[PDB]
């Protein structure tokens, strides 16, 4: 009864246009609420006008002339350029020109599709050169520990508060008796602590969480039957998951 | 005859994926799909006709948003909300869903009207992005705490200099083993300014050689501000880049000489 196809593009969230090529200047006679909301302006604002009202200083000329001769051919054109908000907001549009020919083949009328990419074209990228700059920035800054920790040959370790889970320098695992590749967790050092220590060592280990610095003298029998003194000074740095960092020495020697 | 309607065509040719069902049918199925709602899901017309939309639903589908539509509908009320839908492939997508009643002058519902935008990357990619971006930022505080900590605790006399700069950063034992100030602005020429006229070659040749990424060592003498002699032993090697970073840590050896 009333049109499907006119209410489609009435309720459609998709921005749309239709100019008559007859007209002089190619000017708008329908644009949809969704456009009107897209674009900030008033029906009576844009009826008349050519589209290219839309286009600003941050606009494309190759954009442009791409349009302009799309249009000339009376082809179809899938074109992403920016365009401007009334508030004067610039936007990436995925825009969308097709003709509309009858039967005959004559030109009728140009319809349009108007989406707003800004985030695909502009937020996406953006936010992925910003995680490769912290990747390398990441990289940057382990490789600065890792030198240090090598060169100075420190018995450096870091520890997931709740996880459990255990970094160890080149050092640190030659203190212990430790595998320059296997994988180490509190339990690791733990199954080496000398029975009479293995409290005091567990009770230090949960009061990490505190964020305040401490020390921890313990004793240890490698797995090669060696028993060793070790100071251990670690501090806990708070946050969402907890990471306490320690620095082990061998004091076996002042004995 | 001749005037094809502008409004036909503008659902033809749109890039947003649309449908229209007809309430009086049974089960308000679909009798039209633009070709960009057979582009999203993969279908061929004929396989969408005649069936009601709820074929987009699947496991991962809320009840929630299924009992909203439903309710609206039945209402007779325009909806806007965010699905997850499935392509014929299986494909997961979030559906930005608008589904609208068409209704005649006297107003009765002849059809209803929608519009399926795929928003997957604002409610998907974006999130996960972002998510993934706050991981690293955390990171990259947490691996400089643990740099400032080592130099604290270990008494490490460590220094970075931009290569081609000249820019370093000094911990407070590099500083205290040269003459210098706690914050005081450090560069290549405020430790060559230091160093043993005899030795300041060596030092220079060896800090130019530095861009190679090989690693280096360096024996020089200093006499700092307060007229002290000290024998320092410096071991340093470049970080290789589009920005080059060297790194190095300096020991007072006069003490065993
Ligand atoms: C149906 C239709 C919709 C259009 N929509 C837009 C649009 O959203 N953004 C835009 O920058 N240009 C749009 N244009 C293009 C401009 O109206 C115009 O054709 C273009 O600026 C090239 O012509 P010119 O060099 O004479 O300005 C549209 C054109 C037609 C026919
Ligand atoms: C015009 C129109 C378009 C619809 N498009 C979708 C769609 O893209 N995705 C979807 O999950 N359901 C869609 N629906 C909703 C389902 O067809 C159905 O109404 C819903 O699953 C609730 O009814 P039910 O509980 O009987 O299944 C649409 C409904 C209408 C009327």
Known sequence: ATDPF??????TLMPMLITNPHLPDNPIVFANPA???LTGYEADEVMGRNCRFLQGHGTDPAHVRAIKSAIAAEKPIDID???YKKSGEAFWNRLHISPVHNANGRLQHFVS???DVTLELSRLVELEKERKTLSIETARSKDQLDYIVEVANIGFWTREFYSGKMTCSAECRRIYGFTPD???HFDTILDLV???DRMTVVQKAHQAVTGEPYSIEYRIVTRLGETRWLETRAKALTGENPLVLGIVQDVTERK
């Open 6 to 11: 006119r209410a489609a593009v009435e309720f």
């Open 35 to 37: 456009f009107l909301k």
């Open 81 to 83: 350029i920016i365009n």
């Open 113 to 115: 599709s108007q989406l």
């Open 182 to 184: 296997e994988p180490v």
């Open 194 to 196: 000398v029975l009479e």
